[PDB]
Every structure is written in structure tokens, then in C-alpha cells.
């Protein structure tokens, strides 16, 4: 063909993006990674989506796992391969060793296997093939060279057959060589590397497309998660900067604030409330979530610091009843510890919820909490995730950030996310006569006018009351002001 | 001969400057890298260019990839090789192994292949030769010493024949030995290393001319990109300090601002707009991007923080009308997340757009965003790149930076780009009576006078209104002045 290689869609969520269409038709993609990375799973999701979505027959060749075990473990994702096998759509060809015994199984092996495969393909009219762990085959007594040739033979005979194949391989080091023999990376046309990176005591899964001879692909590692739906990849670096923006306004749940914001937050906008511990971020959230129920809209509240019990105790105490918001089915509370998983897991958790509850407002009490430990880049990436997800989804996001130091805060955010956010509400402590009073400033607002006032405010059972600025002070921001004016009133 | 080693141009963008001229004639250059680095694409771009620019025949010896595949793959970049083959300008010598099977045909191995490569050179009057993955050949069962002889012999037969060769090898360690057997390094005259260095979930491609017997060449790694047009290297260090410089002015889209700058910006200049989050850089960017259209001059606005939609929104609330700008074909919006690529790539995309649109003004909203995560050195290199480019293309550039701390920032740029810039507009907050007012200062202008006052300003639908300075205050730069009555 006078054309540049074409790709078969895998349908594995996110992979097709990273691969600019899927896998090159007629060629073999090697998928390698250490133990428990998702090799096998990937190979099955590949054949499975083929059958279900394009009615393209597949042949799964297995060297170590038993056809029963393969079907069985597939139920973990709601896949009945047993049924597909029956309908002649899927054909697992068992090439594993019988628990008994026979020697010299390396000669005929490949050859007899190739026509076994050939016959299978020809037979069920298959378009997709998966060979799970070729590695275990020469794992009989071979050296690099014997591996290089044997491989080249199977890739080649397979290519001639016209099958779009996925071959699996095991590794021993997360970043060491690509595949056991350091010979496979070259013999294959395409190379994909699945990583199960430790780092901390957490494990981050990532997928990289090392090379796709003939075409272009995204470069690098992409975090992904195995779920009850298989491999789910998040091309955070593929998400486009083309989200929608309306001048539609919506309320903060605190009128005076709405005023300060030029008349309520924009519907399309990511909000951030910062400030030292205890200033009142959670309050503005509660009042923010509520406001979405009072108007009969749906809102979720992912809290990483407090519980569902405490969030309800303190919320009632500020006048709004979360209980009802629940029953009526307009408010949904999540709750979980930042350590209960890794950033890639949370982002998905979040994305999930959002799909089943279709919120109109979303609040994440404390990003500063999800930044506990994680790397700064890994974090920033996460923020783009949630942020960028809700933004294109016309969801108003309110995020919290506790400043690492009360009073004297020289930077809005310690993780520098400032640029990623549309609106920024600042809460700070002001020392005024041996007493600690709050201040509330609408630091910025992208589309609106807002008010440049550092208004003090109080919290009570009614909630937050926004009073007036400290016009007669110098160094408010510092948290430790000073009074001015030296002329009271005298005669002429 | 009696003179300076002659060099054959590769025409591979940027490589000839790196190698000062091209690849040494009649000698063979070793090119190694790990899988997916572009070894093949290099050796094919070598022959392919020889044929298309110089009508120099080429012979492509393949040891693993199939001839039809090598052809097919090249379509990636829009290169019909089947044709070049059919016209006799290129010949793909298929030396790979039989898919079927045999083991006693290659007993005259090395020698026979030399007579085949040799017969082909004389046949097609080949000048350039690419041997792809010689490595896999001895990948049958050999020891280092055995590889140093066969390699030597070959290289020699081609040097005798007089062909200028490109032999490609494969590595396993991005920074370990140059080739599998740590023997090819020294059997070749030239060594070029291709690297796909990971480093933080992102890959960066670099090229390095490790050695070139007999001549000089640029030392160290240069970053490259494999695009639709093949390899493409930016010799960022090879860019000289030879940009033209006029005294002609241009407006900032804000009269008063042009007044503070002694009559606006200099056409040939890099302007920096620093300020804490919210101060108003984008408001300035927009007004700058608009002034180019009113003058019927093209301008590109590379956004990395907001969107085409939002920008358009916010632009509208400040007056103007980005919509019209677009239609009229006077303004172009880009948009992309820093993460949506590595610095090397972004640089390109930018370069790219500029070429297809020939803008008079460029605005990169938030350099500070581009600097996210990357290394400071790799970032400086990026600024020197974009900057230097516009500076040589007579393009006026407005770059934006957001300081990490609002108020009291003690340096214009955290990444330290100040020196690389001609003019620096600075925006800061100032606490006046429990309120947050703005201030704008033309911190520096290399060829003009410019006002030295720290004037306050408001943002209204109409736009930015530069007013008067805080004369009766002390420590305004501290963010929290001290009104002295
Ligand atoms: N329903 C599920 N939800 C979440 N994770 C799961 C689920 N099922 C399996 N997993 C995870 O995926 C893993 C299975 O790995 P998998 O069988 O895909 O291939 P592998 O380890 O790459 O290769 P191989 O097991 O053949 O050596 C489990 O170990 C577990 O970590
Ligand atoms: N009924 C109430 N009356 C007066 N003040 C209250 C009442 N409830 C809470 N507060 C005040 O509000 C503060 C609680 O903080 P809040 O729930 O707003 O979250 P935060 O400051 O954002 O984050 P964190 O509490 O984790 O520091 C307390 O410090 C307290 O002074
Ligand atoms: N049109 C294209 N646009 C962008 N990138 C491309 C395009 N075509 C190929 N690529 C990229 O270039 C690479 C090609 O590498 P190439 O086949 O030239 O040799 P190699 O990777 O050095 O060695 P090997 O033969 O072992 O793969 C691909 O892996 C891919 O990342
Ligand atoms: N319609 C408007 N009317 C009055 N003021 C506005 C209006 N729109 C925006 N503003 C003001 O302008 C500021 C917006 O900043 P701008 O869009 O210019 O970029 P920035 O501050 O430089 O950077 P970033 O917003 O990415 O942090 C807000 O802080 C706000 O005070
Ligand atoms: Mg707290
Ligand atoms: Mg709290
Ligand atoms: Mg390679
Ligand atoms: Mg190659
Ligand atoms: Mg900013
Ligand atoms: Mg901005």
C-alpha cells in the first residue's frame, strides 16, 4: 500500500490516544513489564474489545496459564470469554506444559506452534492475536542469540499471516532492560512498557509506548489504573485546552461574598480558598455545597481531612443540614485518607463519582492534603486532572488549600497551583489587640470585577458574616497590623 | 589527499552545523542508541537526502527490517522509496534471515555480504551507504573480539571502495557503553550517539557527535524531534548573537504604557511582564495582541494557562473582540498544557506556527507555566531558543511570568531570565487601607528612557488605567507601604 501504516483501535480507555489510533495493523506489539503490571490483562482487553466492538475474532495463545484460569480471571471484569469461546468468536489455544513430562520441546515447538496458530487464525477467521508470555517458552535453556532468532521467526511468520498481534514479556527491573533477554526490544516493530513503580510505599502504574515503527505516538509514561473495567489510562498530557466558558454566574452560598465576586462565582470556573488552619475553608465549602441543593442541583463533596460524621456535626452547627441534602439526593459526601491510595487512584475515584452523580458543583476539601508527600510534579499533574476534568464538564469546582504557615504567608499556595485557578479566595488571621480575627479577600477573579477589600469576618451559628476592611491599618497582610491617624478633633 | 577532510552534507536539519559541514567523505560513522531513538530514520534520511538533493545514489543494507517494511515505514514522512528504488537511485540490500529455515548458507559470512554490498555500489554508482543494525548480525553467537574483526574488515572494505557509510548499532543503557559489545566505538572513525533520556515520565531526544576523526564538531548533546519531516535538531548553542536591531517603536496596546516606555516598545525586543497571580499580565498580553491587528499586522498568542474559549470570554469583558481578530486572519490562538509535551517539542510547535503564519507580534502567556517541573537549565535553553528566534525574525515578543509569591517578591524572575530580556514591565499589589490595589512599573528598557515611577492602576471593562504613583508612601516594593503623613 502507498499509504502510511494504519491502526486498529484497541478501545482500551486512553490507549488509543497515546497511540494515535491504536496498534499498527498487520504488525506485532510487544507489551512488557514486571510481575503484576497488567500484561495479560492488556492482551485480553485487546482481543475482547475486538470481538465486542468490531466483531473481530481473536485467538489468545497461552504458554503458562490454563484456559480455565484465563476465562475465570476474566470474570473480574465482567467478561464472559467462556461464552465468546462458545460462539466461535474467541479461541484460547492452550500451549502450556502438561504437569507430567517430556524432553526436547524446542525444535518442532515453534514450527508446530506456528501452524497450530495459523490453523486457529485461518479457522476462526481471526484478525487479532495475543501471545501471552513468549518469555516462558525459551525459558527452557537458551541464550540471547537463540532468543533473538526464535522471536524474529514468530513475528515474521505472524506478519505474513496478516494478524495484528500482542505479545507479552516479563521483566525483573522496573527501569532496567525492557524485556528479559535485552533482545526483544529490537526484534519487535512496536514496544510498550508497563511499569509498576514503587516509590514511597505506594505503587504507581504507568504505561509508555516506547516505539511504533512507521507512525507517531505520544512519548513518555502515562499513569493508569486497573479497574473492574480493565485498563483505564489518563492521557493528562493529551487533554486539550479547549474547555467551554459561559458568563453564567452561580452563588458561593454567602451573599456578601457573591457581591465581592462581582455577583457570584462563574459557573465555568475553578475556585480556590486558601489560608492557615482554622480560618474557615470548610465553612465556605459547606455553604458552597448547600447552595447547590437549595437550588435543587447535584453536588459532591470529597473531603480528605474530616469524616462524614464530623462534617455533619459541624455543618449542622453552622445552620445548614447536610442530612437532608443527602436524603433529597442532591448532595453526596465521599471521605477518605490521602494515604489510602495514590494520586492516580484518587483522580479516577473522583472521575467515577462524577459520572454516576453528574454534579453541578464539586468541592475537594484540601488539595494541600493530597499534596502530602507525593512529588510536586505528580501533584500538579493531579490538579490538572480534576481541574481540567470539571472545567470541560461545566462543573464548578471549589478547592481548598491550607497554608503551611499561619500569618506571614508569602505565597498563596505552597505547591504553586495559583496559575491553574480562575478565582482565588484568601482567608487570613489578623492580630488585632491580643486577639485573632479573620479577614476574607477575593484575591482574584478572572472574568469579574470583585472587591479588593480585606474585610474582616466572623463565624457563628448563622455561618460567616462579612463586615468591613481595616482601613486604618498598615501591614494587614502580615497578620500583625498597626493603627494609624494622629488627629482626633481640636478647635479652629 | 593533502587537505582538510572533506564532508558530505546530510541535509538532516541542524546536523550539519553540529558536525561542521556533514559526515567525513569516504569514512563510516557509527550511530548508536537504544530502541526507538531513530537510528533507522537517521540512516534512511541520510541516503534519501543524498538522492533528492545531490542525486547521489544510495545503498541500504538491512539486517532485520524487511525491504517492503522499510519502504512502508518511510511513508510516515512522505518518502516514496519504492520509487527511488525503481529509478535506480536507491537499492535496499536485503540481508535479513529466512523466516522459514536453514543454517548452512551463511558459511561464507561477512565476505559474501561484502561482495554483495560491493557489487551494488558499482552497480548503482552508490556514494552513500547505510548499514542498519550490524549488531544483530553477530547476534548469532559471538564474543567482543570476534565483533572487532568482522566490523573492522567490513568498514575497511567500504573505505577501500570509497563509500561514505553510516553503520547503525543498538544500546541497552542510555548512558553506559556506546554499543552492545563496547568494541564498535573504536572500530569506527565517527561516533554519533542518539539518546531517548526518560527523566520524570517525559522522554527527551538528544543527539551527540562523540568523535569525528580528523575534524572538529560541536561537543555534547543537542535536542531533537522526530516529526513528520523526520529528524530535526536545534543547535541552540549554534545560534549566534547576531540579531538585527532597530530603533523603531511599536505600541503595547496601552497608550500610557507606551508613554512610560518613552513611546512604546522597540520592534526588535523581548518584553517581560512579571506580576503575582492576578496582577494582570494576561490583561496586558491581550491589549498587546490587539494592537497588532488594529495595525493590520499578524500576531500569535500561545496560551498555556487558560483556553481559547475562556481567553475569548475574558478578552470580551475588557472590550476588544478576539473573535473578529481571528476571522480577519490577523490573530491566532494556540493553547496547550505545558505537560502536553516536552520543552524541545513546544519550542518546535512555536517555531512551526511562526513559519506558517509569519506573525509580527508573539505573546507567550506564562513562561512560568512552561517552567513547571522542567530543570532550570533545560528551561533557560528553551527561553534562549524562543527568544533568540523571534529576535532574529524581527518579531516583537511579549512573554509573561508569574512570581511564586505575591508581595515582597525579592526578584523579578524565580528562574532568572531577566538578563535574557530587553524590557521588563513589572506588576505588583500594594496594600492601601485594607485594600488590594495594583501598580505597574517599567523596571527597565535597554534602548530607551522610560519612566521610573511605580504608578497604580485599575482594571475596568474599558481596560487598564495607569494612574499616578504613591509619592507619599515608603516601602511600596514590600507590598505593605507605610503612608508617611
Ligand atoms: N478487578 C480488579 N480490580 C483492580 N485490580 C485488579 C482486578 N483484577 C486484577 N487486578 C490487578 O491486576 C493484576 C493482574 O495482573 P495480570 O494478570 O493482568 O498480568 P501480569 O502480572 O502483567 O502478567 P502475568 O500475571 O501473566 O505474569 C492483579 O495482580 C492485581 O494487581
Ligand atoms: N459555631 C461556631 N461558632 C463560632 N465559630 C465556629 C463555629 N464552628 C466553627 N467555628 C470556627 O471555625 C473554625 C473551623 O475551621 P473550618 O471548619 O472553617 O475549616 P478550615 O479552617 O478551613 O480547615 P481546618 O479546620 O482543617 O483548619 C474554628 O477554628 C472555629 O473558631
Ligand atoms: N511520522 C512520525 N511522526 C513522529 N514520530 C515518528 C513518525 N514516525 C516514526 N516516529 C518515531 O520515530 C521512531 C522511529 O525509530 P526508528 O524506526 O527510526 O529506529 P530506532 O528506533 O532507532 O531503532 P529500531 O529499528 O530498533 O526501532 C518511532 O519509534 C517513533 O517514536
Ligand atoms: N471585567 C473585569 N472588570 C474589572 N476587573 C477585572 C475584570 N476582569 C478581570 N479583572 C481583574 O483582572 C485580574 C485578572 O488577571 P489577568 O487575567 O489579567 O491575568 P493575571 O493576573 O496576570 O494572571 P493569572 O490570572 O493567570 O493568575 C483579576 O484579578 C481582577 O481583579
Ligand atoms: Mg486545616
Ligand atoms: Mg477543614
Ligand atoms: Mg533499536
Ligand atoms: Mg534502527
Ligand atoms: Mg498567575
Ligand atoms: Mg493570566
Numbering used by the authors:
A (entry chain E): 14 to 505
B (entry chain D): 14 to 498
List passages from the publication reporting this PDB structure.
Various mutants, including the KaiC T432E/S431E double mutant (KaiC-ee) have been designed to mimic the hyper-phosphorylated state of KaiC. Glutamate or asparate substitution of phosphorylation sites is a common approach to emulate the phosphorylated state of a protein. Glu, in particular, is spatially similar to both phosphorylated Thr and Ser, however Glu and Asp only contribute a single negative charge instead of the two negative charges of a phosphate group. To gain insight into the active site properties of the KaiC-ee mutant we determined its crystal structure at 3.0 Å resolution. Analysis of the region around the two introduced glutamates reveals several important changes compared to wt-KaiC. First, in the wt-KaiC structure both S431 and T432 are engaged in close contact with R393 from the same subunit, but neither E431 nor E432 are close to R393 in the KaiC-ee structure. The KaiC-ee mutant was designed to mimic a permanently phosphorylated form of KaiC that is unable to oscillate between the hypo- and hyper-phosphorylated states. However, the conformational changes observed in the structure of KaiC-ee and the presence of an additional phosphorylation site have to be taken into account when interpreting functional observations of this mutant. Therefore, the latest results indicate that the KaiC-ee mutant has a severely distorted in vivo rhythm. Despite the noted structural variations, the KaiC-ee mutant is clearly of use in biophysical studies and the changes in the overall structures between wt-KaiC and various phosphorylation mutants observed in the solid state (this work and) and in solution are not dramatic.
